[PDB]
Write an enzyme that holds these catalytic residues in place. Structure first.
Site, PDB file in Angstrom:
ATOM      1  N   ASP A 155     -60.877  85.805  45.998  1.00  0.00           N
ATOM      2  CA  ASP A 155     -60.205  86.227  44.774  1.00  0.00           C
ATOM      3  C   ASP A 155     -60.722  87.604  44.312  1.00  0.00           C
ATOM      4  OD1 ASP A 155     -59.049  85.980  41.933  1.00  0.00           O
ATOM      5  OD2 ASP A 155     -58.583  83.938  42.633  1.00  0.00           O
ATOM      6  N   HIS A 188     -59.445  87.220  36.786  1.00  0.00           N
ATOM      7  CA  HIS A 188     -58.717  86.105  37.388  1.00  0.00           C
ATOM      8  C   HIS A 188     -59.668  85.247  38.227  1.00  0.00           C
ATOM      9  CE1 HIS A 188     -56.141  84.420  40.707  1.00  0.00           C
ATOM     10  NE2 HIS A 188     -55.218  84.313  39.774  1.00  0.00           N
ATOM     11  N   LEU A 212     -69.940  74.627  34.894  1.00  0.00           N
ATOM     12  CA  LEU A 212     -71.102  73.729  34.909  1.00  0.00           C
ATOM     13  C   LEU A 212     -71.005  72.589  33.864  1.00  0.00           C
ATOM     14  CD1 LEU A 212     -73.811  76.489  34.980  1.00  0.00           C
ATOM     15  CD2 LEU A 212     -73.128  75.012  36.931  1.00  0.00           C
ATOM     16  N   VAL A 238     -66.558  74.920  29.128  1.00  0.00           N
ATOM     17  CA  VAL A 238     -65.645  73.929  29.700  1.00  0.00           C
ATOM     18  C   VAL A 238     -66.422  73.149  30.779  1.00  0.00           C
ATOM     19  CG1 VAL A 238     -63.480  75.214  29.174  1.00  0.00           C
ATOM     20  CG2 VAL A 238     -64.766  75.765  31.308  1.00  0.00           C
ATOM     21  N   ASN A 261     -45.395  81.986  42.133  1.00  0.00           N
ATOM     22  CA  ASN A 261     -44.771  81.871  40.823  1.00  0.00           C
ATOM     23  C   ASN A 261     -43.356  82.452  40.836  1.00  0.00           C
ATOM     24  OD1 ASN A 261     -47.296  80.940  39.893  1.00  0.00           O
ATOM     25  ND2 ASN A 261     -47.864  82.990  39.041  1.00  0.00           N
ATOM     26  N   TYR A 318     -47.851  78.606  55.069  1.00  0.00           N
ATOM     27  CA  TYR A 318     -48.301  78.160  56.417  1.00  0.00           C
ATOM     28  C   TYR A 318     -48.626  76.667  56.393  1.00  0.00           C
ATOM     29  CZ  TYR A 318     -48.787  83.129  57.509  1.00  0.00           C
ATOM     30  OH  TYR A 318     -48.512  84.447  57.732  1.00  0.00           O
ATOM     31  N   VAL A 331     -52.193  75.307  55.516  1.00  0.00           N
ATOM     32  CA  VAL A 331     -52.697  75.513  54.133  1.00  0.00           C
ATOM     33  C   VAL A 331     -52.012  74.526  53.162  1.00  0.00           C
ATOM     34  CG1 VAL A 331     -52.773  77.268  52.186  1.00  0.00           C
ATOM     35  CG2 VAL A 331     -53.120  78.006  54.601  1.00  0.00           C
ATOM     36  N   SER A 375     -51.880  79.907  40.333  1.00  0.00           N
ATOM     37  CA  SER A 375     -53.329  80.232  40.489  1.00  0.00           C
ATOM     38  C   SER A 375     -54.270  79.239  39.800  1.00  0.00           C
ATOM     39  CB  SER A 375     -53.661  81.558  39.822  1.00  0.00           C
ATOM     40  OG  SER A 375     -53.260  82.636  40.664  1.00  0.00           O
TER      41      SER A 375
HETATM   42 CA   LIG Z   1     -69.899  73.547  30.659  1.00  0.00          CA
HETATM   43 NA    NA Z   2     -48.638  75.034  53.517  1.00  0.00          NA
END
Ligand SMILES: [Ca+2]
Ligand code: NA
EC number: 3.4.21.62
Lengths: 281, 64
Positions: free
Chosen positions: A32, A64, A75, A81, A155, A171, A174, A221
């Protein structure tokens, strides 16, 4: 106090956490824009940058990659979060620059790094409308080598009866992931097509952002790292399961939603996936 | 509400920016090379313009 984003609950990750499984010792590459390793709600174990003008994979100039990473593995503590797989070993594999874009060879070099460094799971919250032989070869090689490879479906929304799933999600090797909201309704931007494999939460997903921030992002994403994180939870409970088995476990235990053109197999359910016997709920 | 501009394919990047800003004045326009891989978040305020090596639009611009 920590908050559990709705999407972590929606895929039933807390059931795995209560059994004692959080992704410990599973290596997950977030391929990324980098990951902000200074965020106090992330622990980055390692990484590498394939972006020629941005050589530090631990500096995320876009935001991103950091958001994606927090959905995988924020964590488990008293702040921020909670990630799907909060004990996972997180690797920042920077292949996208500040502007959100990377050359195919950068993505491919990142996939090769992941293979060479024994990553168990790759998340690619990224895509483009054309494939290449070299891109297909890289993802196929990662899969042949035992890596679970998960990518955003794209998207592009609908386009009549045409598939709008992008690469590398398109593919077969994936797992292509579409986006639903908290009601299990497909997001209107979520790509469609027979290549769509499963869905995960991808609307108003709270996660980590650079400079010790948090925020709600939208996208396939955001859906992909719920599935990469789920794969890490599964592997932490069944460390000898192959990528083949992890992939089937997630596919075979989804909650089916609508037609597979729009929803693939449905919403992942990591509680059901991580049992020995699999069926849909 | 217009969210895609198929009529801009093959026009200059300049004309594309001008047209998109008439329809969506608050648009955050980012110009990228066609044939790159990009992040898959959905940002309602953004319009990416994918350009060929001549700086003409090479893909239908859309919001996201
Ligand atoms: Ca946390
Ligand atoms: Na695929």
């Amino acid at each position: 106090a920590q908050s559990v984003p709705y999407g972590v609950s929606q895929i039933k990750a807390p059931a795995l956490h209560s059994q004692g499984y959080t992704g410990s010792n599973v290596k997950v590459a977030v391929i990324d824009s980098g990951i902000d390793s200074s965020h106090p709600d992330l622990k980055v174990a390692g990484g590498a940058s394939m972006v020629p003008s941005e050589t530090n994979p631990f500096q995320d100039n876009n935001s991103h990659g950091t958001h994606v990473a927090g959905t995988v593995a924020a964590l488990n503590n008293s702040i921020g979060v909670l990630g799907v797989a909060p004990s996972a070993s997180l690797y920042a594999v920077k292949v996208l620059g500040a502007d959100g874009s990377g050359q195919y060879s950068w993505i491919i070099n990142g996939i090769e790094w992941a293979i060479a460094n024994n990553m168990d799971v790759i998340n690619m919250s990224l895509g483009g409308p054309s494939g290449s032989a070299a891109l297909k070869a890289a993802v196929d090689k990662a899969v042949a080598s035992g890596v679970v490879v998960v990518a955003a479906a794209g998207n592009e929304g609908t386009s009549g009866s045409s598939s709008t799933v992008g690469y590398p999600g398109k593919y077969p090797s994936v797992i292509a992931v579409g986006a639903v909201d908290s009601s299990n309704q497909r997001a209107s931007f979520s790509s469609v097509g027979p290549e769509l494999d499963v869905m995960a939460p991808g609307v108003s997903i709270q996660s980590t952002l650079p400079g010790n921030k948090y925020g709600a992002y939208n996208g396939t994403s955001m859906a992909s790292p719920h599935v990469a994180g789920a794969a890490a939870l599964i592997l932490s409970k069944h460390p000898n399961w192959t990528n083949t088995q992890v992939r089937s476990s997630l596919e075979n235990t989804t909650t089916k939603l609508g037609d597979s053109f729009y929803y693939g197999k449905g919403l992942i359910n990591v509680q059901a996936a991580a049992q020995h016997h699999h069926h849909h709920h | 509400m217009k969210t895609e501009w198929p009529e801009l394919v093959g026009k200059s990047v300049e004309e594309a920016k001008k047209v998109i800003l008439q329809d969506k004045p608050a648009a955050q326009i980012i110009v990228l090379p066609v044939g790159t891989i990009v992040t898959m978040e959905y940002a309602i305020d953004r319009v990416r313009l994918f350009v060929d090596r001549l700086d003409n639009i090479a893909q239908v611009p859309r919001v996201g």
